[PDB]
């Protein structure tokens, strides 16, 4: 089980890391776009949470590209970006799941649970 | 594409059925647990959307039963049950997405397709 984590806010993504590695996975954490394709050439994670606005590409920008070049993994976005629409607009890009910020840690762990589950059965 | 839609407020299973016909699947629509079960023996959907609040046995002990016994398919919870322990407790129990009323048309189907998508690559 390898989680790759895209989040430029360094306090949230070190947290979330932290919980992912207790919950028992190997962690790669990226602050942005280009650092994820990084981690992702270097080790394809099983799932992927990924963050909206990031300082260059952003993160719908980024599903988007991962999608068109076959990169299949599961897709947890975990995002500022409330409305609806966005939802819908990034579901429709190849998003998996969407929750939103502030989060409660346990929902985000168990909605990664469900596409895990599902995606090793 | 088979839908099975277990919903007890008759106007709204009406109305979700029309949609998910129009999207084009076919579409089976309960109104009860136990009518869940019916349309499930008589033909596998390749996904059900399943609401909590139900007559008799809540949509909670339905999704165990089911997981319990090898019914593997995609279930996206869709209830008026807020809170996020709720959501935890659902998705643990084998649910894939959960969403909460009042909803988006748009935003279900992108997450039912999302499941689909998925499901079927
Ligand atoms: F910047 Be992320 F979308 F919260
Ligand atoms: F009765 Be359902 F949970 F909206
Ligand atoms: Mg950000
Ligand atoms: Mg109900
Ligand atoms: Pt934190
Ligand atoms: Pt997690
Ligand atoms: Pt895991
Ligand atoms: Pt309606
Ligand atoms: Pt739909
Ligand atoms: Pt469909």
Redesign the interface.
């Known amino acids: 089980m390898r989680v790759l984590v895209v989040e430029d806010n360094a306090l949230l993504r070190h947290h979330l890391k932290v919980q992912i590695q207790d919950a028992g996975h190997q962690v790669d954490d990226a602050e942005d776009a280009k650092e994820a394709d990084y981690y992702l050439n270097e080790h394809i994670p099983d799932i992927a949470i990924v963050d909206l606005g990031l300082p260059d590409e952003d993160g719908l920008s980024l599903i988007r590209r991962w999608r068109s070049n076959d990169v ?1 993994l ?1 897709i947890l976005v975990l995002t500022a970006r409330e409305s ?2 966005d ?2 607009e990034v ?2 890009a190849g ?3 969407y929750v939103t910020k502030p989060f ?1 840690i ?2 985000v762990m ?2 990664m ?2 596409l895990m589950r ?2 090793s ?1």
């Open positions: 299949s599961p609806w629409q939802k819908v579901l429709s998003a998996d799941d409660h346990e929902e168990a909605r649970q469900a599902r995606n059965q």
